[PDB]
mmCIF file of C-alpha atoms in Angstrom:
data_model
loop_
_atom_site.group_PDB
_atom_site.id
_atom_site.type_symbol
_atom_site.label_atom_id
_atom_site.label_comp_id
_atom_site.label_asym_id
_atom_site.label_seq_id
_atom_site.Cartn_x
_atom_site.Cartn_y
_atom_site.Cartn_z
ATOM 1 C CA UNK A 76 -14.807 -14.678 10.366
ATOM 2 C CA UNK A 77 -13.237 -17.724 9.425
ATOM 3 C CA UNK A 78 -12.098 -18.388 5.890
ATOM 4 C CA UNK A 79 -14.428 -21.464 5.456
ATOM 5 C CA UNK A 80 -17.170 -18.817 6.881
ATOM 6 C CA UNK A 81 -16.071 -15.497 5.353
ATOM 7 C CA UNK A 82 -18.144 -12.319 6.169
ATOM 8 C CA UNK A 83 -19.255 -10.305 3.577
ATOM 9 C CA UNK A 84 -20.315 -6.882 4.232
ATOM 10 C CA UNK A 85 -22.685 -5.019 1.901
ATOM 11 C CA UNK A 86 -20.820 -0.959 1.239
ATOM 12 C CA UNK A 87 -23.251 1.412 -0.529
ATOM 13 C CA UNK A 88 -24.506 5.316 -0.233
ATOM 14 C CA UNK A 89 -21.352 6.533 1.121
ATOM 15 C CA UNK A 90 -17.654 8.235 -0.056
ATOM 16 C CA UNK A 91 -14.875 5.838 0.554
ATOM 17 C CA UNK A 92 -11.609 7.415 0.799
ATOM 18 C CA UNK A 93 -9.826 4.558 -0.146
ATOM 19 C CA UNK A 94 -6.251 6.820 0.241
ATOM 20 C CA UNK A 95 -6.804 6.418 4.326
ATOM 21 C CA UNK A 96 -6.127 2.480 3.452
ATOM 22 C CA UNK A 97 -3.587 2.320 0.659
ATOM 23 C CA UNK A 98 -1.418 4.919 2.539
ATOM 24 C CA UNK A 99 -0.974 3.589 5.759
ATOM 25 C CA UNK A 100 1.972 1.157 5.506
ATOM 26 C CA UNK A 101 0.224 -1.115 8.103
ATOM 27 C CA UNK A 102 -1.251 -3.180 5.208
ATOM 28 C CA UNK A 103 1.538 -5.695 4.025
ATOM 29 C CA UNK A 104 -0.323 -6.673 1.073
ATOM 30 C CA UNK A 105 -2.584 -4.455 -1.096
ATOM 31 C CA UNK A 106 -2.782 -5.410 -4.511
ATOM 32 C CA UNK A 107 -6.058 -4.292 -6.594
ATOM 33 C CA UNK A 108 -6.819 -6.033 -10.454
ATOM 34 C CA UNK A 109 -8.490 -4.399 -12.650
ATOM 35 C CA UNK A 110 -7.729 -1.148 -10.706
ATOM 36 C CA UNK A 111 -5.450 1.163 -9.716
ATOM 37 C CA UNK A 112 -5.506 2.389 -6.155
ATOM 38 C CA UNK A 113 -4.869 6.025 -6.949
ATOM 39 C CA UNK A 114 -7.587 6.154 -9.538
ATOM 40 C CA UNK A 115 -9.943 4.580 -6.163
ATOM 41 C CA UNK A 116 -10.723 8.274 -5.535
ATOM 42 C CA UNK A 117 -11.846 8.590 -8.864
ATOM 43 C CA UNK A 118 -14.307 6.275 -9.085
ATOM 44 C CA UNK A 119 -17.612 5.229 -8.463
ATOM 45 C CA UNK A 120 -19.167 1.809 -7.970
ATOM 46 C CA UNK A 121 -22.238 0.336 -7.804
ATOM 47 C CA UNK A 122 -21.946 -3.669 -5.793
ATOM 48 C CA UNK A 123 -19.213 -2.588 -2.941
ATOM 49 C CA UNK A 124 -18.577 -6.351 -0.994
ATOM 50 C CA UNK A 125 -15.943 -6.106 1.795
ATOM 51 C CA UNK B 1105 20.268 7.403 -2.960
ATOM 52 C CA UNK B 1106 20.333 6.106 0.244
ATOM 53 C CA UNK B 1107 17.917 5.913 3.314
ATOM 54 C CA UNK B 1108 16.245 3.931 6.126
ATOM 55 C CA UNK B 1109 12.799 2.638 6.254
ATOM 56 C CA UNK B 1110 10.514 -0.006 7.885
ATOM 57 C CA UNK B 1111 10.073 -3.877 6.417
ATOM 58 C CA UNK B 1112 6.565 -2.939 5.209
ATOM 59 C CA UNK B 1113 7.246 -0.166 3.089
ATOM 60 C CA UNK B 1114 10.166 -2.098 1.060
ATOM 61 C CA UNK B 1115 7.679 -2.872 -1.318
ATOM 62 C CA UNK B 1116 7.317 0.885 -1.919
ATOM 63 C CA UNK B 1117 10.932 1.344 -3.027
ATOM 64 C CA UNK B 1118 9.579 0.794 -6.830
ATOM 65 C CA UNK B 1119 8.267 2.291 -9.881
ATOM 66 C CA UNK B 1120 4.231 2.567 -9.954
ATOM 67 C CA UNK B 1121 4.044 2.254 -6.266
ATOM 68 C CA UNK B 1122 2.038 3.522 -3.650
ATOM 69 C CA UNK B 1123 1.991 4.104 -0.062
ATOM 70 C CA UNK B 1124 3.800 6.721 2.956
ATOM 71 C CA UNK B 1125 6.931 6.284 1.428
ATOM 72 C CA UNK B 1126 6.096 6.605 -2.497
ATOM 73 C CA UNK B 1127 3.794 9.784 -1.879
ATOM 74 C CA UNK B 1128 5.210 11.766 0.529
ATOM 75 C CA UNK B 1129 8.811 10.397 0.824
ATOM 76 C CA UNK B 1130 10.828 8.756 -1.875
ATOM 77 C CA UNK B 1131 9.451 8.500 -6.033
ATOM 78 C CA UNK B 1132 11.136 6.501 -8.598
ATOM 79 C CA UNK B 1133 9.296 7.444 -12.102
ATOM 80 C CA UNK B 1134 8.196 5.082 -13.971
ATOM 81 C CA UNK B 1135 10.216 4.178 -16.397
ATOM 82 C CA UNK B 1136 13.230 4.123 -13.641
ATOM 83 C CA UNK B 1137 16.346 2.319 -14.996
ATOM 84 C CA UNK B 1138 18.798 0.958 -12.513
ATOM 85 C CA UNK B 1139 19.153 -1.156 -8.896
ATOM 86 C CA UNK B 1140 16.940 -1.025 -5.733
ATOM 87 C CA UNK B 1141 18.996 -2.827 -2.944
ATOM 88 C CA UNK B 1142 17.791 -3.356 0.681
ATOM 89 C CA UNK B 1143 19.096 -5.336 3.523
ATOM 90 C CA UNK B 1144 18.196 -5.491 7.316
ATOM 91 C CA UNK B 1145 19.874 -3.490 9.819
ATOM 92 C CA UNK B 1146 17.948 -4.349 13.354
ATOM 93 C CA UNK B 1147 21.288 -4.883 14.885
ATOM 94 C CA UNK B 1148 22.149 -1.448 13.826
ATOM 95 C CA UNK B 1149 19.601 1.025 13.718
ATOM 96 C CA UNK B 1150 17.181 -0.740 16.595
ATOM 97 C CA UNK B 1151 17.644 0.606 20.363
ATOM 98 C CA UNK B 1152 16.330 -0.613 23.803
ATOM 99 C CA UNK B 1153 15.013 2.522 24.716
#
């Protein structure tokens, strides 16, 4: 979408192995606040919004 | 300590970092003291083929 119009997808009742994303080097920029990505599959949420 | 790696994974080559590299290939700890120099080499290390 574009930025003016940005998507927002709804994630809920489901594992996200968030290790898949931050290991892949593909991603030049992945920088999480408030978090740490290798505590990611530690954790639980409750309001997931891609 | 010296290597070769990709443009992408640069950022990598640090303390607290994640990614291919950090995990799997190449850890500084955390409280690493000293240098982290890195310089193109596509004239080099690149090949047609």
């Amino acid at each position: 979408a574009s930025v003016y119009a940005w998507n927002r997808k709804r994630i809920s009742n489901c594992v996200a192995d968030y290790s898949v994303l931050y290991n892949s080097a593909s991603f030049s920029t992945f920088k999480c606040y408030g978090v740490s990505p290798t505590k990611l599959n530690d954790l639980c949420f409750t309001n997931v919004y891609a | 300590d010296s290597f070769v790696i990709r443009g992408d994974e640069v950022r990598q080559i640090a303390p607290g970092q994640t990614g291919k590299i950090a995990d799997y290939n190449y850890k500084l700890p955390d409280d690493f003291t000293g240098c982290v120099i890195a310089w193109n080499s596509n004239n080099l290390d690149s090949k047609v083929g």
